[PDB]
Design a binder for this molecule. Structure first.
Ligand SMILES: O=c1ccn([C@@H]2O[C@H](COP(=O)(O)NP(=O)(O)OP(=O)(O)O)[C@@H](O)[C@H]2O)c(=O)[nH]1
Ligand SMILES: [Mg+2]
Ligand SMILES: [Mg+2]
Ligand SMILES: [Zn+2]
Ligand SMILES: [Zn+2]
Ligand SMILES: [Zn+2]
Lengths: 559, 47, 65, 138, 84, 114, 130, 43, 155, 266, 163, 196
RNA sequence: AUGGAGAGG
């Protein structure tokens, strides 16, 4: 397991990663020193003898250069020490170990390698500074942020293997994954929040900015689109200039809730012939959804066009957002006065309900639900009540928020955040729980020495009325600390057991593959599936479609 | 500002981490598992 | 260590104001705010540069070497 | 003089502690947090100050009661990885590797517990004029 | 034994692994200065030359597809369909 | 360690010219000019001054990467109007405005106290 | 040439969580079977309640968009508020009621009439005056 | 240094969870992440 | 009704009524024979298995059954001639394109789908009143003699 | 004159507060950029430490030494060390100034910027003299010496651009604001209740007319009137800061024009 | 439980029925009770389904369970993967666990099985029983450092004179 | 990292000209993304920013103690008294163009700390180097100029892709590779290959 | 090399 199933390899590197909005999807920002260290052997041919001669003439320490020169006999010429590093006549048949250069196919990897998307072939773009740089739409299949994450890189050492990387393990080829028959890459973070902020009907762009955005597209035809507004001022819309990033022949249609071809709330999504007709663009569209724009462009135009699409969208949106600006303050977590009052009185009536149920249960008037204890029924009731309380106050807090609320904007865009974040930050963080149950009695018949014995009240068993905006009480803080602690614990346990289970799963179905008769077998020839997937289709080339014959009345069917 | 509370071995500052253990001479009763023949066990670690 | 020569944020010289700051503090018996106000440190970044700084060289000079 | 006692958990099992010394006395600001009224009477002990439930590393966190607990934990773990002045005599010790911050600063937001941890004398970080914003996307 | 040129049940379309393998081998040959059977037209990269040589079906290789029983079917690159 | 030199932001390298005028293959009568060792300070100004010319159809600039201090500038004018002339006229306009501004500020400063 | 011309009476104005664009609802002052819904940039051309706007559809006044020069070239409008959009749907309510859907860079429009030369084409100049 | 000098180690039902009895004796927040979580504690 | 199927037909149709720019006010130049026999012959070219014996043929029809159901449902004479009104050229284009895209959607022999499956199951597991999640999955894979929550659902 | 206009509101040795009229936004912003970075200044670039028995490290002191403001009036008649034909540095490109300090008294012996001594020949050029805006006349505090501690070094000051290092910054913070009433609507104000009461009122509002509610949005308007306040570190006087800024921008524009002239060669 | 049921008019309509959940399992006797539907009764214990209803029903129940665990977190994995797992678990005849007691007791190559869990004892018993290795296992060619007959190496490349 | 578990590395560095600027001319020493706020819920970060701002302006020491009655409302009131937006917002201008920004930026002092880990202490690359003695495989560690272990999971990935040749390359030419002689009878490494 | 401690995703 340590030397045969996995051994340390040469021509490898590893560094801290960072994002770069101006790199293509299938590119990787490689530091100059790494480009000088890692090397590739290239046989001297009439096609490249000049370039190779130049590279040898440069030698190491200067990129692009070479490290060693192998002759016919097999002698290795160390350029950095040789007395003849200046005068070398490259003969045909000789090998030249040159530095890694641009557009070289290298294997990018990030541990833990959970699936095939954790090892993808990128094109090298040598850059200054000591960080591996990557696009913000490749961050998801790698599952990587930039808070100190490190990644590994491997270099192929022959033509056939770099061919294997460029024709199989390429990033555009891995856009649509056979795991969930959907694209595993999409627009996120600033580009997502920005593409949400841009496609609003209020967003209008004047001439100059439009010209700049247009020129920022590498695949721009150089044709200025007629502005949506002619008089009095020639204005464009975010949709109109974003359409430039979308290729022709692209048809997208999606109705969401009250979408009636006119969209009073500007929801849904209609795009015709690479031109967005109507609908705010966000995660449901430009994200990595099943019927998403990325999936469509990928399956229609191709992987290359789709990666270039990532490029265009990113450049344009990031440009617009750069000169528009977006932030987040504590004011975005502050609800109105009457809202906070309604929240407080809601929590109050909730605790009042808990009080009534408790006083009812203590009088032996409580009737136990069929199949559970009186105490269990009580606990279930109180817990459900406090949950309904946190949810009530939470929705009460979300309704109060304006459209200009930054956090709410990021929630709408699907960039980052959700309802529970709003609820816990502005309204109520809710009930703390350990092992599925509320904070138990570590001390005899009481949770803390600050309470009396037998205190099943909410504020005792670990309920927190306060939000993060108001601040927690000592008891609330400690209970929250218990819950979070259990969170970290079960997190570590979870990743451990999941790791082991994953290993077992892989080692179980290791030698299983589809043969040239579409028969899923193993090393013994034992048939697992006579036809792979019971249909013989690859999971990548599969989309969820509606069978409109199975539904509807017989009258409508006949009609 | 050096608070001390450590040793010096071969020039290296060494710290003795407090080791947590169960209190001895304490009487504790524990409920045993279901497949187990015994139901309860009252034990005490004598020191 | 010792008072930084210039403000990080903008670049305004704040190295010649330390001793005058201490003089405005202990001799004239003023609060830190007014002291930082009289030294022409209007921006809260330059103001930070002096208010936040701790003179550690004084403890460094205690040693004999 | 019998004003303060030493209590372990086993003896703590049989006492009633008041969180604040103002919980012994028998219209409001909506801004402040909601605190449950003291429904107890027979107090035997009172807490010195609740902020003493924290450790040395956690006492450096500003408003730890306004954060999700794992964040407080992460900060507690990363505080030991920050650079600053670990000792005044750093220039006369032959340590294998020591990092000393060029221009340390005592944080504008402090804890009352920082006084006893000598953090304002030997800080580990600087006050950065920070900006929360979407700029170049880098 | 073998399998006759008729009654061949395997896919007439070239698999991605077959394409990568052929392009790889051909690129190896070209990388070791082998005679190019297509007009370079500016191309010097052995892989790209192999691709252009594949688009014109000027590759004199053959694919032996093994069956789990031991049998095998031959498919020349010129005969195989490249739809990818 | 891998950080580039500071003078590489305003000092031209070996064989690097200041301007690289290239025929734009996209639209007819258009040009893409590569400005080396310059940033937004000049680009934004030149581009904004190219829009004042009413015989200019298109004018845009961009810095393809913040690592390297260089920017591309695409210009498109009407037929019978060479874009280089538009660039020159814009530049001279900038120069005149700046000169007049300098004179004005000097004459204004000559009337101040303290 | 021209494709459509009529005088409408604004009956409703709706700023649905917006501050620059308001969806308008007007009806024809000539045909009692004609109506119109239309998103309007109020920040440019304000449309108050109970107004009578003159509405026109045109095919001209493709190539890139050259600078204005209205006082130099043929503007062919002298209106107050001009837009350019694209028809994307031709709905038929009844045989005597035909509705068309235009999209002006997101600013949508539904025109319901009866008697039309409105074909599915990029050409869609919406001109409004007074 | 201050943190390391006041550390608690634990060898080997739920010794990782924050127990109620830890109130005022052990820091509820300060504990290593990943492996020795809950086991290694600070006073 | 919504189920993962190989070839997307809707996009092909809406691409057909765009590539040829068909107007919705013009009689189609098709025939009943064209559509019916056209689709009926289209079902013949959707090859997953390419044997000649009866067994392989049955396996074939069984393998293309569902997609053929979708095909017949979407390319019905009424639907073709009325719902989007396709012409002759557009119809032939649709058929050919469907065939091609179907032949593209076939799994490539040699595809290590065992490891792919194991990874496709193991990876989402890392991102995770009966027992569920990782412990339950552990029970399932271990084939637990004693499960933590044995349930009996009786209708 | 004929084009843009300047209206000085405040003036001092350190600050200039003025209004810039009839100018495009790009020109004003670019002027700000040039004033911040692309203005030549003299600062310590080299440090030769002979003996250093002080608390502070060598390059630690070299840093603040470099950050010390030096006189840069006649910096224009000095030359870049990369342009001068001399070896290393001479007197036509660099200004050498020694620094010698030593603990004498039992009390802490302070080391300021007044202790810097010009050694190289200035030949009539007002340059190199460290700016001292200090009241007592000491200047920037370099470091502190005990009793037996000594600091013997020698600095070499060269001509540089703030674009290369912030130590060559001729200005501090440049105040900049256009349209205090948001009549151009380039900013969408964040609020909880009232957008006007929450956001304070700018000083520059007194110079412009308040927007009437009976008026629609002026869409044809542009950014003409700007409000600026330039602050100088001391190396270069404020008026000379802005003048050299304008002249620099104009100079590089003229250089681009010259390049255009040069590209017509066969 | 709510339930979609085909209405006599055609369209599927929600028809809510009463279903009995149960803590406790004994499928062998519950389904034979007069009163309930003995064709829709189901248990979360696939181990009982495998014993009572057969190996195919056990397969369906196993897939149902795995799919339920996956979709419990709101996730979604395509059918063929889980189906492949369940099939390889059920093709041996019974429920083959994904452990050293399950599939690692198969008749595959010695090296392959020795590259997982029990290593030395496997090599010992294989060395005692004199087992032949097909060398068509992936891990085996991984050990031998050869191009494993997988993916790109699933075929051979030769030349034919057509020039 | 800040003092609230908000860690992160430097993506890039901009000069004061390219930096956004307030009307005062103040430039941010550091720019963090808003997205690192709602999903992590570190409100105390923002609160400590507001408090540090007010304490900076007033020239006092802000009390950020755990359980106090110091609320965001009082702090906002104090900040408003100093002539700023009570919620810490500031209208800023885009440094590249000088044009205003639509949204206002949460701008103010926040205590950050330079953590232990630095790139140049982590970076590593090896084309070829010293092997171990026993297994003749690339040595372990960066400090020994070693190679990265192509783990079992990586092998699984390369199998999933189908790149067999690359797997062989990583398991032969990349790491250890040996030429051995085998008998045609017993089939063991008993052969005494006397070369030359 | 063996063994151990702490830390990073
Ligand atoms: O042992 C470990 C610990 C941590 N990690 C990795 O470190 C990351 C923690 O980093 P993070 O908690 O700062 N944020 P993140 O996980 O991206 O989630 P979200 O706020 O919704 O954006 C996790 O996502 C794991 O992938 C490991 O891979 N292994
Ligand atoms: Mg993340
Ligand atoms: Mg991370
Ligand atoms: Zn400052
Ligand atoms: Zn000189
Ligand atoms: Zn032998």
């Amino acid at each position: 397991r340590g030397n045969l199933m996995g051994k340390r390899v040469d021509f490898s590197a590893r560094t801290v990663i960072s994002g770069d909005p101006n790199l293509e999807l299938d590119q990787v920002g490689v530091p100059k020193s790494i480009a000088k260290t890692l090397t590739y052997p290239e046989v001297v041919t009439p096609y490249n003898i000049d370039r190779l001669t130049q590279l040898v003439r440069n030698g190491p320490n200067e990129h692009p250069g070479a490290k060693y020169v192998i002759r016919d006999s097999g002698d290795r010429i160390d350029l950095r020490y040789s007395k003849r590093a200046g005068d070398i006549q490259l003969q045909y048949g000789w090998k030249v170990e040159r530095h890694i250069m641009d557009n070289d196919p290298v294997l990018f990897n990030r541990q833990p390698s959970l699936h095939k998307m954790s090892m993808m072939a990128h094109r090298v773009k040598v850059i200054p500074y000591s960080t591996f740089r990557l696009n913000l739409s490749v961050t998801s299949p790698y599952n990587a942020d930039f808070d100190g994450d490190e990644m590994n890189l491997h270099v192929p050492q022959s033509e056939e293997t770099r061919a294997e990387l460029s024709q199989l393990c390429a990033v555009p080829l891995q856009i649509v994954s056979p795991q969930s028959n959907k694209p595993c890459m999409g627009i996120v973070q600033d580009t997502l929040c920005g593409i949400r902020k841009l496609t609003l009907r209020d967003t209008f762009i004047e001439l100059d900015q439009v010209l700049n955005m247009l020129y920022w597209v590498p695949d721009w035809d150089g044709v200025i689109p007629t502005p949506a507004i002619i008089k009095p001022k020639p204005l464009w819309s975010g949709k109109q200039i974003l359409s430039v990033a979308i290729p022709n022949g692209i048809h997208l249609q999606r109705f969401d809730e009250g979408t009636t071809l006119l969209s009073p709330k500007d929801n849904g999504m209609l795009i015709i012939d690479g031109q967005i007709i109507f609908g705010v663009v966000e995660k449901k569209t430009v994200g990595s959804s099943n019927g998403g724009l990325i999936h469509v462009v990928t399956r229609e135009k191709g992987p290359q066009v789709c990666a270039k699409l990532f490029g265009n969208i990113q450049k344009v949106v990031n440009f617009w957002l750069l000169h528009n600006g977006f932030s987040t303050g504590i004011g975005d977590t502050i609800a109105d006065g009457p809202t906070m009052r309604e929240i407080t009185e809601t929590i109050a009536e909730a605790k009042k309900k808990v009080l009534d149920v408790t006083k009812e249960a203590q009088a032996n008037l409580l009737t136990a639900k069929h199949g559970m204890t009186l105490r269990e029924s009580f606990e279930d009731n109180v817990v459900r009540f406090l949950n309904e309380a946190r949810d009530k106050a939470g929705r009460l807090a979300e309704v109060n928020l304006k459209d200009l609320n930054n956090v709410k904007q990021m929630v709408m865009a699907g960039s980052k955040g959700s309802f529970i974040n709003i609820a816990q930050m502005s309204a109520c963080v809710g009930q703390q729980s350990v092992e599925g149950k509320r904070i138990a009695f570590g001390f005899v018949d009481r949770t803390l020495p600050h309470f009396s014995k037998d205190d099943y009240s909410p504020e005792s068993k670990g309920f927190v009325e306060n939000s993060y905006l108001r601040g927690l009480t000592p008891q609330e803080f400690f209970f929250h600390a218990m819950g979070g602690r259990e969170g970290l614990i079960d997190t570590a346990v979870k990743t451990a057991e999941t790791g082991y289970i994953q290993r077992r799963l892989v080692k179980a179905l290791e030698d299983i593959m589809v043969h040239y008769d579409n028969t899923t077998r193993n090393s013994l020839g034992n048939v697992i599936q006579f036809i792979y997937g019971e249909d013989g289709m690859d999971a990548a080339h599969i989309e969820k479609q509606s069978l409109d014959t199975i539904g509807g009345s017989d009258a409508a069917f006949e009609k | 500002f050096d608070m001390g509370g450590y040793f010096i071995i071969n020039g290296s500052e060494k710290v003795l981490i407090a080791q947590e253990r169960s209190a001895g001479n304490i009487v504790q009763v524990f409920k045993k598992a279901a497949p187990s023949p015994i139901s309860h066990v009252a034990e005490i670690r004598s020191a | 260590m010792i008072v930084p020569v210039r403000c990080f944020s903008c670049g305004k010289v704040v190295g010649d104001k330390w001793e005058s700051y201490l003089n405005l503090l202990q001799e004239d018996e003023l609060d830190e705010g007014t002291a930082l106000s009289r030294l022409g440190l209007k921006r809260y970044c330059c103001r930070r540069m002096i208010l936040t700084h701790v003179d550690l060289i004084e403890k460094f000079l205690r040693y004999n070497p | 003089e019998g004003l303060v006692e030493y209590i372990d958990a086993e003896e703590e099992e049989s006492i009633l502690i008041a969180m604040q010394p103002e919980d012994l006395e028998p219209d409001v600001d909506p801004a402040k947090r909601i605190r449950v009224s003291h429904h107890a009477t027979t107090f035997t002990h009172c807490e010195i100050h609740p902020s003493m439930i924290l450790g040395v590393a956690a006492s450096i966190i500003p408003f730890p009661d306004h954060n999700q607990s794992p964040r407080n934990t992460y900060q507690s773990a990363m505080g030991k990885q920050a650079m600053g002045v670990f000792l005044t005599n750093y220039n006369v010790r032959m340590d294998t590797m020591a990092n000393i911050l060029y221009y340390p600063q005592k944080p504008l937001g402090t804890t009352r517990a920082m006084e006893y941890l000598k953090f304002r004398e030997l800080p580990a970080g600087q006050n950065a004029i920070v900006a929360i914003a979407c700029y170049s996307g880098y | 034994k073998a399998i006759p040129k008729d009654q061949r049940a395997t896919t007439p379309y070239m698999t991605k692994y077959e394409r990568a393998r052929i392009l790889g081998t051909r690129a190896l040959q070209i990388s070791m200065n082998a005679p190019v059977f297509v007009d370079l037209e500016g191309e010097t990269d052995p892989l790209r030359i192999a691709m252009k040589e594949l688009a014109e079906k000027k590759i004199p290789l053959v694919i032996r597809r093994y069956l789990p029983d031991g049998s095998f079917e031959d498919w020349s690159v010129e005969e195989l369909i490249v739809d990818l | 360690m891998n950080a580039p030199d500071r003078f590489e932001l305003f000092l031209l390298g070996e064989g690097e010219s200041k301007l690289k005028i290239d025929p734009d293959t996209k639209a007819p009568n258009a040009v893409v000019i590569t400005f080396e060792k310059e940033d937004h300070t000049l680009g934004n100004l030149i581009r904004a001054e190219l829009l004042n010319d009413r015989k200019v159809l298109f004018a845009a600039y961009k810095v393809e990467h913040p690592f390297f201090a260089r920017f591309k500038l695409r210009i498109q004018t009407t037929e019978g109007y060479d874009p280089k002339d538009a660039l020159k006229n814009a530049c001279n306009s900038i120069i005149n405005k700046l000169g007049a501004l300098k004179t004005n500020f000097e004459t204004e400063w000559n009337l101040q106290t303290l | 040439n021209t494709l459509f011309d009529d005088i409408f009476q604004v009956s409703e104005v709706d700023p649905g969580r917006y501050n620059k664009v308001c969806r308008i609802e007007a009806a024809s002052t000539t045909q009692d079977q004609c109506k119109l819904t239309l998103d309007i940039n109020v920040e440019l051309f304000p449309v108050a309640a109970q107004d009578s706007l003159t509405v026109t559809i045109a095919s001209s006044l493709t190539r890139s968009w050259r600078p204005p020069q209205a006082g130099d070239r043929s503007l062919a409008d002298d209106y107050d508020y001009v837009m350019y959009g694209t028809a994307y749907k031709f709905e038929e309510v009844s045989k005597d009621l035909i509705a068309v859907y235009y999209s002006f860079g997101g600013l949508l429009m539904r025109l319901e009439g009866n008697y039309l030369n409105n074909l599915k084409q990029e050409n869609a100049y919406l001109l409004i005056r007074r | 240094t201050l943190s390391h000098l006041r550390r608690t180690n634990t060898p080997i039902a739920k010794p990782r969870q924050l127990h109620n009895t830890h109130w005022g004796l052990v820091c509820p927040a300060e504990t290593p992440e990943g492996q020795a979580c809950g086991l290694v504690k600070n006073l | 009704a919504n189920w993962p199927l190989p070839v997307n037909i809707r996009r092909i149709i809406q691409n057909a009524q765009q590539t040829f720019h068909i107007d919705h006010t013009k009689p189609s130049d098709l025939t009943i024979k064209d559509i019916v026999l056209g689709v009926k012959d289209l079902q013949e070219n959707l090859l997953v298995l390419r044997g000649k014996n009866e067994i392989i043929q049955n396996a074939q029809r069984d393998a293309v059954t569902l997609f053929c159901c979708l095909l017949r449902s979407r390319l019905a004479t009424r639907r073709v001639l009325q719902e989007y009104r396709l012409t002759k050229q557009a119809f032939d284009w649709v058929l050919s394109n469907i065939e091609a895209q179907f032949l593209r959607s076939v799994v490539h022999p040699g595809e290590m789908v065992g490891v792919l499956a194991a990874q496709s199951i193991g990876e989402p597991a890392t991102q995770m009143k009966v027992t569920s999640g990782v412990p339950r999955l552990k029970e399932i894979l271990n084939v637990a003699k004693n499960m933590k929550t044995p349930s009996l659902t009786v209708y | 004159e004929e084009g843009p206009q300047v209206k000085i509101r405040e003036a001092s040795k350190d600050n200039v507060d003025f209004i810039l009229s009839n100018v495009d936004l790009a020109m004003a912003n670019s002027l700000r950029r040039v004033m911040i970075a692309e203005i030549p200044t003299l600062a310590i670039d080299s440090v030769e430490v002979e003996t250093n028995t002080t608390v502070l490290a060598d390059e630690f002191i070299a840093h603040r030494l470099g950050l010390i403001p030096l006189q840069s009036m006649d910096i224009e008649q000095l030359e870049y060390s990369r342009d001068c034909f001399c070896e290393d540095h001479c007197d036509k490109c660099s200004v050498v100034l020694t620094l010698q300090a030593f603990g004498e008294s039992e009390s802490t012996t302070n080391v300021y910027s007044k202790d810097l001594v010009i050694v190289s020949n200035l030949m009539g050029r007002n340059i190199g003299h460290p700016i001292i805006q200090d009241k007592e006349g000491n200047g920037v505090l370099i470091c502190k010496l005990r009793k037996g501690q000594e600091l013997k070094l020698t600095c070499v000051a060269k001509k540089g651009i703030a674009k290369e290092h912030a130590k060559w910054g001729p200005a501090a913070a440049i105040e900049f604001e256009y349209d205090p009433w948001n009549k151009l609507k380039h900013t969408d104000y964040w609020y909880e209740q009232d957008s006007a009461k929450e956001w304070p009122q700018s000083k520059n509002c007194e110079y412009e007319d308040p927007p009437n509610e009976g008026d629609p949005f002026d869409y044809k308007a542009q950014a003409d009137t700007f409000y600026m306040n330039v602050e100088s570190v001391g190396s270069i006087p404020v008026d000379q800061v802005v003048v050299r800024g304008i002249d620099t921008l104009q100079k590089k524009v003229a250089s681009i024009l010259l390049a255009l002239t040069q590209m017509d060669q066969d | 439980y709510d339930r979609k049921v085909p209405s006599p008019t055609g369209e599927y309509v929600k028809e809510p029925e009463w279903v009995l959940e149960t803590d406790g399992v004994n499928l062998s006797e519950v389904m034979t009770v007069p009163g309930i539907d003995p064709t829709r009764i189901y248990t979360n214990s696939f181990i009982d389904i495998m014993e009572v209803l057969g190996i195919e029903a056990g397969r369906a129940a196993l897939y149902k369970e795995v799919y339920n665990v996956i979709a419990s977190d709101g996730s979604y994995v395509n059918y063929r993967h889980m189906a492949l797992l369940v099939d390889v678990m059920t093709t041996q005849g019974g429920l083959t666990s994904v452990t050293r007691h399950g599939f690692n007791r198969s008749n595959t190559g010695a090296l392959m099985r020795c590259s997982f869990e029990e290593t030395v004892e496997i090599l010992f018993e294989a060395g005692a029983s004199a087992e032949l290795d097909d060398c068509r296992g992936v891990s085996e060619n991984v050990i031998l450092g050869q191009m494993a007959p997988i993916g790109t190496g699933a075929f051979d490349v030769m030349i034919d004179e057509e020039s | 990292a800040s003092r609230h578990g908000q860690k992160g590395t430097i993506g890039i560095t901009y000069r004061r000209e390219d930096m956004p600027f307030t009307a005062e001319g103040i430039v941010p020493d550091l720019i963090i993304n808003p997205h690192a706020i709602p999903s992590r819920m570190t409100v105390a970060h923002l609160i400590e920013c507001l408090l540090s701002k007010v304490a900076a302006l007033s020239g006092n020491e802000g009390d950020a103690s755990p359980f106090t009655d110091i609320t965001v409302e009082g702090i906002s009131k104090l900040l408003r008294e100093h002539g700023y937006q009570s919620r810490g917002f500031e209208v800023m201008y885009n440094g590249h163009t000088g044009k205003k920004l639509m949204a206002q930026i949460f701008f103010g002092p926040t205590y950050y700390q330079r953590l232990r880990h630095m790139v140049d202490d982590k970076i590593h690359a090896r084309a070829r180097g010293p092997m171990q003695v026993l297994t003749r495989q690339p040595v372990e560690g960066r400090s020994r100029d070693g190679g990265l272990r192509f783990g079992e999971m990586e092998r699984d990935c390369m199998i999933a892709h189908g790149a067999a040749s690359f797997l062989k390359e990583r398991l032969m030419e990349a790491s250890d590779a040996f030429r051995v002689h085998i008998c045609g009878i017993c089939g063991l490494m008993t052969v005494i290959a006397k070369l030359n």
